[PDB]
Design a protein around this ligand. Sequence first.
Ligand SMILES: [Fe+3]
Ligand SMILES: [Fe+3]
Lengths: 337, 304
Amino acid sequence: STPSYSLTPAEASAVAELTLELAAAYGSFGDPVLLRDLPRLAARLPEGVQDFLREFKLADRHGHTVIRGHDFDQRRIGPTPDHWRGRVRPGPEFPEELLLMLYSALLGEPFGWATQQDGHLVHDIFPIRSHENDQLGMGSKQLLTWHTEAAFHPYRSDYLILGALRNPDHVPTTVGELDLSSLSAEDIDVLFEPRYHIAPDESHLPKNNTIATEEEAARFATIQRMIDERPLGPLLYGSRLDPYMRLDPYFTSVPQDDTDARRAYDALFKVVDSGMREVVADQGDVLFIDNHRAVHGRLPFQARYDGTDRWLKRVCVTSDLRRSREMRATSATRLLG
Amino acid sequence: TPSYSLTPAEASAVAELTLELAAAYGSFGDPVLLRDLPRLAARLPEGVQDFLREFKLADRHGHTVIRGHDFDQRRIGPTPDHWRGRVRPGPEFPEELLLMLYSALLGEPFGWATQQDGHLVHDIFPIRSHELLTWHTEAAFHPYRSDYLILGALRNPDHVPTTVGELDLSSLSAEDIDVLFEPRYHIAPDESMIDERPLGPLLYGSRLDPYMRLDPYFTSVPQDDTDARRAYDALFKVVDSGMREVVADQGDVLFIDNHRAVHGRLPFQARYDGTDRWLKRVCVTSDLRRSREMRATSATRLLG
Ligand SMILES: [Fe+3]
Ligand SMILES: [Fe+3]
């Protein structure tokens, strides 16, 4: 099936030790020196773990992989919080967040969305009672149906890194890839063509934010133009033999009169749906998603709200930070918005 | 403009590393070397990694230089007559490896399948057979052009310059810039499947501090677009008049940001006796996957 790496207890221990040393040496993520040193620091990780991610990145074949067996010290980490707002930064789980930042530097550059949890590079995935009814990360009861992250956005993540601090009930993440053998050459061709409209989530709508001041007008200008012009785009791209995809069923409009587009899209939708895997990121697992080769989602679960709930950390990764310069306030900031 | 001058200790640490690596891997066709490159770059002196990383993340300067490497002139040998025919890797392999390590610090080495048999490390030396004063963005037309160029000067006995120039913005007005940000210019290919099409901009990214792709010789503006030709003229004047002479001396490695700086070379009398100027050159991509459609396999780093 899809490769994973299981850490020996020695490797788990060397990672944990690195991670505590760095938490203590660096103050927060607000320290620009940390961001600068990341790739050099990620080269102190066990070499087998660095070779493995590098092969995964370079092979550009599997849509996800997992590194299992980290030691995430429960007593040190503490209770799953009630909310992301108002916590002291960094929390006692700072070593785990640093972990994920080191991994993100092996794969490219960590970045974040200005609208998402105040733009924390490593963000939180846990149940907030007040968000109980919503379809998202901090949700619970609602099925989070599968999708490419920010499918419509030309600067969407290349990879996503999910780190499970706890998952007492073993609640799986859904991830699914494209079995191309299942699609007709006719359907593929159609899917490669600019025929499909992919709509922004509300979170990316520009009229969300500060209407005036030239800066912020120029910065949303590309997304505005996209809303105003509704250009059609492909669902499949890269190589015909092994294509990338971006599929967000909920926000995709197949134009009514394009009979060929509809036929191929249903083909594509059905293949990806029936290929969907449940992947359990247990405590001490880190899940890597290739945003160009897999969709992901999450199953509903009952939350307790007592500090014992599932708690994942998440980092968005770009292979090319400069590409998005137009959507960033400064050269230095890693936040779009 | 920021540069880093190696101590002799640093210089020796680098030479030693590149010699150890050269004995350890056969050639660049070794997929394991290619895999290992970021991890191996992390064995270079720390101050050098931090310096390069500050340059990449600052995204402020058009070029930078790391000075005072120890390029062993006896080992490296005389400057050859041609690249073609020549066996690879040669005795200058240590220095090519260095450039590959630098390139892994900035992104990923790639090349073009139709330049020099698609050797990831290109040669720059006088050839009799193929025997300027222009400046350009590398592959300005191409959407998968280099993000950075790395130029290592194995030797440059007559101190012949490279030309590099950036955009001084304050000499352009906000009308001209706004025009240049729009998709109203054609940029032609070269002797270099997915093909010719739309009209691109010249300036992009932030409007307060723009990137550029600017190849004067192969740029055209539709006659009818007179706002465009006016603000084009005003961009060229700014750029051409800002050009600097940068000498990549023996032991210098020049890093050019392909989005913030154009470069060219200056004509020079060659002598063809094995003692001429020899640079090496590696093209760097921030996002190798972005070019997948023009590469024959997942694994190859050659475009086309
Ligand atoms: Fe998601
Ligand atoms: Fe050139």
